[PDB]
Amino acid sequence: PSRLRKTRKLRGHVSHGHGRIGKHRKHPGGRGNAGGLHHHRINFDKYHPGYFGKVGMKHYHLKRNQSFCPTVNLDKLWTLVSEQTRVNAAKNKTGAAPIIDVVRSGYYKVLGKGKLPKQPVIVKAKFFSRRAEEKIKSVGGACVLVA
Amino acid sequence: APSRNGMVLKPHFHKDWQRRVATWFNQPARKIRRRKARQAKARRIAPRPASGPIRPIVRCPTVRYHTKVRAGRGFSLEELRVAGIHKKVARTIGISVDPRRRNKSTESLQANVQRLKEYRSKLILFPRKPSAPKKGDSSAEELKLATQLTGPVMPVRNVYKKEKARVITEEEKNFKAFASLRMARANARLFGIRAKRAKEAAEQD
Amino acid sequence: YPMAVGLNKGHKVTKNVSKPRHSRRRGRLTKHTKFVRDMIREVCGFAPYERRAMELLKVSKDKRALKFIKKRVGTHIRAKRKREELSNVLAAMRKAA
RNA sequence: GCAGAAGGGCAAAAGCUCGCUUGAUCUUGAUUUUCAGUACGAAUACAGACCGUGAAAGCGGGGCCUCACGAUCCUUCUGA
RNA sequence: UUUAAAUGGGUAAGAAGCCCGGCUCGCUGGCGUGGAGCCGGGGUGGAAUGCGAGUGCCUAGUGGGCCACUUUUGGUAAGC
RNA sequence: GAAAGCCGCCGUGGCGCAAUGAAGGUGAAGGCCGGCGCGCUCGCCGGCCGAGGUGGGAUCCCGAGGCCUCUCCAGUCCGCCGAGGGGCACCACCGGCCCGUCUCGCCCGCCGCGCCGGGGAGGUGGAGCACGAGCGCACGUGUUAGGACCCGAAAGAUGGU
RNA sequence: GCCGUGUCGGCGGCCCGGCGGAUCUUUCCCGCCCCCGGGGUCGGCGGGGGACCGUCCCCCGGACCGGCGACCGGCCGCCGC
RNA sequence: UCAGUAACGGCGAGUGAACAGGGAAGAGCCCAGCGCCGAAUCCCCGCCCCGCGGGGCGCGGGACAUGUGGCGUACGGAAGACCCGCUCCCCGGCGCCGCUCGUGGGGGGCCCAAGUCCUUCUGAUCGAGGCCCAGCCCGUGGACGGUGUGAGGCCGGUAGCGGCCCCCGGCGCGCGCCCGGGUCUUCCCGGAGUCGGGUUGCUUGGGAAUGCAGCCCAAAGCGGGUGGUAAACUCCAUCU
Ligand SMILES: [Mg+2]
Ligand SMILES: [Mg+2]
Ligand SMILES: [Mg+2]
Ligand SMILES: [Mg+2]
């Protein structure tokens, strides 16, 4: 849309949006991210702290599957199953607990986040944080680990 | 060259890049070229299906992906051995063979042995001149269609257990917890050392 | 009680016990071939990095006789398959006498 | 007179002399000083130990105060 | 330097203030002592003049200046 | 028509919904009432609830009172309304929670009693939570990598005449 | 003759509606493993039914305007020949 | 996609992979060596079989080759002797007859309808008109030239339209080769100046050397390679 952009409205002004004095040439501060410590220090400080140096252990050839663990915290603990069973199996004729597993829903770890409701469930995951299991064991549900 | 707050950028155009560029102005032309090589191939051969052989069921390599099922390469002989067909007979019947594939489970082995005989159940052959060595009558009353599509026996079938509902018992609601992992990990990095501290008690003499 | 982390990791599956592959058997001695290489160390002889190595092994040092093969054959674990069979041929040249 | 350059400041003292001594130590922050309201530097009040001195109140984390000093990366050491 | 202006700089001119009643504390400790915090209750008009304000985002240009009373430093002096 | 439409048991994946530590790893809920173990500054059981609280806070609600041709017999309405209420977003603040650490003190657990686990109270570091706002497309502006607004060297290198 | 959102009923087609649901179904259907030529579901598997929930399709009853959902006759008041 | 990520770098400027995972296509095999078969192997030469535009099995003569040709054989195991239960195939060509998939490919010549009336212009391809069938053809209104703007005047566009010629893959007589399968028994089982180490140059993201190359040292057989921090021990994983 060259009708809409700037250079039509500026076409006729001499210096073309760049000033008489400075007179925009090509590269007055060097090409790229030049001048890290020398003469653009105040730009790299105050907007990018931490850019200069080592911090940690080198780790040759990590493979992004060994440390793969997704998290459902307990807000989303009932989006896994249908709404059809969070009320149909909510009737305490006896301890009719539904199971909920997350490793068929693409999740490995169950973390904690507030308001697990008052239905006793059995929740299957490979890892439970100890706030999450004490929200399941304090609504009368059990927390069955699986692999 | 940088100004007020922004990303720091390493754009990889310092190298010469305008002499290797690849516009895909032929990717519609390459799609309807390789549909002619599926139209005029699947009709040219046979009532044999398109999309190749029967592939077996294969479970993925990454911890990330071991929970799922994939169309693998070939039934690795053993599945040709428990089901009992000859290996060089198998790849003209329409059964893929991958000899460098191993089986270190009995759970996964019978998961393809039933699959292979199920393929051999839904197979009909054409004997040459109708003396019929070990094929039945007229051609399964007819071939019923010309070609099959997108895989023989639907190689995904990512099935899952129902596991309907249960009563929480006494043992299940007291034990199996987070502290059963912190001591489980503590028998992973404090196990070899405790083999060595018991050698200290066998040299205490 | 399955668990994905710990000592007994992973999904509990049964294991197939089966005859190993035939490429897995590469360097068995296979008596026909031992007959060749025992016939050949009396028709050909030894090398001059091991004519000297036994005459340090029979007398002076066996650390240094290891440390002489260590320098002249590549690895340390190759030199514990030379030294303790240089000594064996020296044994059956000594204790067959 | 107070190590030295000046200026402020100092009297049963901040000077001299005697007696003891290691607060010139260990640790988190906040604040001031040129300041962009960034850093090093120096400095001010604190809080937690552990100590010294004094009969005691207290006073001390360097010199009566204002200067006396130095990043990344790398090397060296010390700590669980 | 005893003294010491003119011009000048900071704060203040209220309801976010005052007062009364009651609880808290692991601080302070002759002492319901001190001091903070929290809760409820009673009373608005608080120098003159003028005026609609607060608040965040992205940011171009610029980073050679010069002149004049006035006060001034170096200079014999200057359109220095 | 090198379009357009469809797939979803092609959502693999990308970015987002969870952060933090060098790392192993860990990983964001409170408020009240009853009561109890020596209510020890420390602590525990049953229920209701449920993102805590102070100050402002547009809007909305209640609203004493005021409003018409004779004085009583009344209605939806309208009109200002002193005070008072529920207070969106956002701002200042106090409180809590997660993780790294630091100091201080006891308590609890046992696929099996240890140079094991789990914990509590205060202080701090964090690109966090405290009822999510992102993704995709398009356009404008700004800043860079690209011959990069057009035109400009003294030079440098390779291969040749 | 109309259609909006509903209660039900006739489940009327569910076993000759459509589609879902990590609802429910070891008395159901074969091929498995476990157990001394056969059995015990003996627990689940791969497969294939049908019972049930939620939502849109014919009927009679019920709701209000009959609204761009319209034809009919009836009226007033136009208009043209 | 992983990912402008691990990693490299006066750790500055900047460069920067791979495995997972989803797709396109998916075809597998041969030998040396260890062994059995009395070289059962091949080339050239000459004759005739008899065939095209020629290539063959026959018939006789010179070579290669035992320093090792050909059959079976390849690490997924193989070979022989058993025993038992099934089966005689496949392979190319041949003049040819029938299909061809857009109905194969190539070539040439053909296939709808207005110049009818008025009118303007130098010229029409313009303007207007064609009763009630809408003047006419439309599977043909793409385009092009034609005295100017043309569905109809002409090439031609449309059509699983025809006919004509030449070549493609696939009938059936005369060719030519021609027993596999499961258990048990025994026997065989593998590539060296190569692998690796020391050093030196280049290179890479490869970082206590990833690859490459030189020079030196130079292997073993339960051996060897790899397992992304140098190393020793100890299991294991995978590969040959
Ligand atoms: Mg400029
Ligand atoms: Mg600009
Ligand atoms: Mg996009
Ligand atoms: Mg030159």
Q: Is B188 on the interface with C (CB under 8 A)?
A: yes
Q: Which residues contact B36 (CB under 8 A, 6 or more apart)?
A: none
Taking the C-alpha atoms of residue B69 and residue B151, their distance in angstroms, rounded to an integer, is: 14
Phi-psi region of C30 (alpha: psi -120 to 50; beta: other; left: phi over 0): left
List the Cα angle C66/C68/C72 in 5-degree steps: 115
- Chain B CB contacts of C13 below 8 Å: 105, 107-108
CA distance B119 to chain C (A): 24
Order of strands, sheet of A109-111, starting from the edge strand that comes earlier in the sequence: A71-73, A109-111, A127-128
Q: Which of residues 21-80 of A touch strand D (CB under 7 A)?
A: 37, 42, 45-46, 52-54
- Ligand with the closest atom to the CA of A22: 1
Cβ B109 vs Cβ B103: under 8 Å: yes
Question: How far is it, in rounded angstroms, from Cα B72 to Cα B47?
Answer: 24
| Cβ count within 10 A of residue C67 | 15
What does the alpha-carbon distance between residue B34 and residue A128 come to, in Å, rounded to a whole number? 50
- Between the CA of residue C29 and those of B168, B191, C26, C35, C92, what are the distances in Å? 61, 39, 9, 10, 19
Contacts of B34 (CB under 8 A, 6+ apart): none
Residue type, C63: K
Reported residue count of chain A is: 147
Q: Retrieve residue C6's tokens.
A: 């710990």
Contact A147 C1 (CB under 8 A): no
CB contact under 8 A, A145 and C2: yes
Q: Which of C6, C7, C13 sits opposite B105 (nearest CB)?
A: C13
Q: Assign residue A126 a region: left if phi > 0, alpha if psi is -120 to 50, beta otherwise?
A: alpha
Which residues on chain C are in Cβ contact (under 8 Å) with B108?
13
- Determine the residue type at B80: L
**Best CA proximity match to B165, nearest among A92, C1, A79:** A92
Round to whole Å and give the CA distance between B145 and B123.
13
Q: Which two tokens stand for residue B19?
A: 């002499």
DSSP type of residue A88? H
CA-angle at B153, arms to B81 and B59, nearest 5°: 65
**Minimal C-alpha gap between A121 and chain C (Å):** 19
* Residue to substitute from A104, A121, A126, A131, interface B, most B β-carbons within 10 A: A104
B73/C86 Cα distance (integer angstroms): 49
Residues of chain C contacting B100 with CB distance shorter than 8 Å: none
DSSP assignment of B4-72: SS------S-SS--SSS----SSHHHHHTTTTHHHHHHHHHH-SS-SS-SB--EEE-SSGGGTTSEEE-
Q: What are B54's strand-pairing partners?
A: B95
Shortest distance, CA A75 to any CA of chain C (angstroms)? 25
Q: List, in sequence order, every residue forming a beta bridge with A96; answer none if it has no partner.
A: B167
Q: What is the resolution of this structure in A?
A: 3.7
Report how far residue A96's alpha carbon sits from residue A119's, in angstroms, rounded to the nearest whole number. Answer: 10
- Of all residues in chain B, the one with the smallest CA distance to C17 is B104
How far does the centroid of ligand 4 lie from the alpha carbon of residue A109, in Å? 68
Please report, for residues A126, A143, A144, B151, the alpha-carbon distance to residue A115 in angstroms, rounded to integers and kept in the order given: 21, 16, 20, 46
- How do beta strands A96-97 and A109-111 pair? unpaired
Quick one: CA dihedral A16, A19, A23, A28, positive or negative?
A: negative
CB C26 within 8 A of CB B202: no
Method of determination is: cryo-EM
Q: How far apart are CA A16 and CA A21, in angstroms?
A: 12
A145 neighbourhood in chain C, CB within 8 Å: 1-3
Distance B136 CA to G47 C1' (A): 25
Q: Using CB atoms within 10 A of its CB, is residue B166 exposed (0-12), middle (13-18) or buried (19+)?
A: middle
* Whole-number Å distance between alpha carbons of B159 and B111: 13
Query: Residues in chain B, how many?
Result: 205
CB B123 within 8 A of CB B94: yes
Span CA (C88) to C1' (F111), Å = 50
Q: Please report, rounded to whole angstroms, the spatial distance between the CA atom of protein residue B68 and the C1' atom of nucleotide E38.
A: 60
Report CA-CA distances (Å) from B20 to B15, B17, B27, B171.
11, 6, 17, 67
Yes or no: say if A127 and B181 are a contact pair by the CB < 8 Å rule.
yes
Cα distances (angstroms) measured from residue C84 to each of B85, C75, C91 = 50, 15, 10
Ligand nearest the Cα of residue A24 is 1
Note whether A126 contacts C4, CB cutoff 8 Å: yes
Nearest chain A residue (CA) to B68? A104
Q: Is the dihedral of CA C84, C89, C92, C97 positive or negative?
A: negative
Radius of gyration, alpha carbons of chain A: 29
Chain A nearest CA to B109, separation (Å)? 21
- Residue B119 contacts residue B153 (beta carbons within 8 Å): yes
Compare CB distances from C16 to B109, B180, B184 and report the shortest one's residue. Answer: B109
B151 torsion bin: left (phi>0), alpha (psi -120 to 50), beta (else): left
Are C86 and C70 in contact, with CB atoms under 8 Å apart?
A: no
Chain B touching partners, 3 or more CB pairs below 8 A: A, C
